[PDB]
């Protein structure tokens, strides 16, 4: 049930889908939140196949943040095609402020900002302040990355290949989704653990696959819409690739993500085994790493099948 150019047999054979038991209540509860926040007149299935093991309240807050994220991206796109640079700048500034102090913005006149503030307020309630500050530091970067995308897209500038890859780690919010692994498994990871090279590399590859596979699926539509910002378009524009050639290159980069992930997933799980040193704290850290890496794995199949279902 998958067009041959988009089919990844290793995902189909070796990454069995998982579904969180709270999924049936997720979409309606998110709809109710969007309605209460006046953010509409779904990515919830995507999240339910990703953050396995999350407490119901954690998954619900992630789903609401994820849905808020979809509304912000629609607004961003509309400001882009209407060239509303003043409106975008003001939103960009309000989101930076609301991120650091959400409580002051819970009833802001801009419903997108008030909804962001409540979403982030709820995410800040699961782990210690040090995790909250990490999330904020990471999302400040996402906001500025969205600003560089506004710059490129309003001016019709196609970024270079590495320039796009570096930017897309930020607009896709790679490190936000990675941060959210930790409230899902109930444990803030020490820097020495989450900065372990196997943990970092596993987390990166999971996110690269998701962002690059999205670009692969959307490439034909986006070149026909004269878009910029897609890995295939940077390759066409800057490496003189034809469309078929760019589809083949993105596809190979996507396939290699998988097998590179399988190798580093072994290293991350060995590390998880090393953390279980016979102490209670070590067992806790080991289970958290193993749960987090398992969800890094779940991202692959959740994203793959989401594209073909939605």
Cα dihedral sign, 128-20-137-198: positive
Residues 210, 199: Cα–Cα separation, whole Å: 17
Tokens coding 47: 């999240």
Q: How many CB atoms lie within 10 A of CB 299?
A: 24
Q: Which residues are annotated binding-site positions? A: 73, 77, 214, 218, 222
Residues 19, 13: Cα–Cα separation, whole Å: 17
Q: How many CB atoms lie within 10 A of CB 14?
A: 14
- DSSP for 216-275, please give it: HHHHHHHHHTT----HHHHHHHHH---HHHHHHHHHHHHHHHHHHHHHHHHHHHHHHHHH
Residues with their C more than 2.5 Å from the N of the next written residue in the chain, i.e. before a break, are 41
Q: Is 4 exposed, middle or buried (0-12, 13-18, 19+ CB in 10 A)?
A: exposed
Query: Quick check: 33 and 64 in contact, CB under 8 A?
Result: yes
CA 133, distance to chain mean position in Å, is 18
Tokens coding 83: 């060239």
Note the helical H segments in 82-128: 85-100, 111-123
CATH of the domain at 116: 1.10.600.10
Residues 219, 296: Cα–Cα separation, whole Å: 25
Query: Quick check: 131 and 174 in contact, CB under 8 A?
Result: no
Residues 263, 202: Cα–Cα separation, whole Å: 9
Q: Which residues are annotated binding-site positions for Mg(2+)? A: 73, 77, 214, 218, 222
Residues 299, 296: Cα–Cα separation, whole Å: 5
3-state secondary structure of 213: helix
Q: How many residues does the chain have?
A: 310
Q: How many CB atoms lie within 10 A of CB 291?
A: 21
Structural domain containing residue 56: 1-310
User: Dmax of the chain from CA atoms?
Assistant: 60
Residues 276, 170: Cα–Cα separation, whole Å: 33
Counted domains in the chain: 1
**Residues near 80 by beta carbon (within 8 Å), at least 6 away in sequence:** 88, 150, 153, 154
Query: Quick check: 23 and 52 in contact, CB under 8 A?
Result: no
């Amino acid at each position: 049930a998958v067009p041959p150019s988009l089919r990844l047999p290793v995902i189909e054979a070796a990454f069995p889908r998982q579904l969180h038991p709270y999924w049936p209540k997720l979409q309606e509860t998110t709809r109710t939140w969007l309605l209460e926040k006046r953010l509409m007149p779904c990515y919830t299935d995507l999240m339910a196949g990703y953050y396995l093991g999350a407490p119901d309240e954690v998954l619900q807050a992630i789903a609401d943040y994820s849905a808020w994220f979809s509304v912000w991206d629609d607004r961003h796109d509309r400001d882009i095609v209407h060239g509303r640079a003043g409106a975008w700048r003001r939103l960009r500034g309000l989101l930076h402020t609301a991120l650091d102090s959400p409580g002051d913005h819970l009833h802001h006149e801009d419903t997108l900002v008030a909804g962001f503030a409540d979403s982030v307020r709820r995410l800040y309630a699961f782990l210690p302040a040090t995790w909250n500050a990490r999330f904020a530091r990471h999302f400040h970067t996402v906001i500025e990355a969205y600003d560089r995308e506004f710059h490129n897209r309003t001016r019709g500038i196609v970024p270079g290949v590495e320039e796009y890859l570096e930017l897309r780690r930020l607009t896709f919010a790679h490190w936000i989704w990675t941060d959210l692994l930790e409230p899902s498994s109930g444990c803030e990871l020490p820097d020495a653990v989450r900065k372990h090279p196997a943990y970092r590399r596993a987390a990166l590859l999971s996110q690269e696959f998701a962002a690059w596979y999205n670009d692969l699926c959307s490439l034909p539509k986006e070149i026909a819409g004269d878009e910029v910002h897609n890995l295939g378009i940077s390759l066409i524009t800057h490496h003189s690739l034809t469309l078929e050639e760019a589809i083949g290159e993105v596809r190979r980069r996507v396939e290699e993500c998988i097998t590179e992930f399988l190798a580093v997933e072994r290293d991350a799980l060995r590390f998880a085994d090393e953390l279980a040193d016979g102490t209670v704290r070590g067992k806790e850290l080991s289970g958290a790493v193993r749960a987090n890496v398992g969800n890094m794995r779940n991202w692959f199949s959740s994203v793959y099948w989401f594209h073909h279902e939605s």
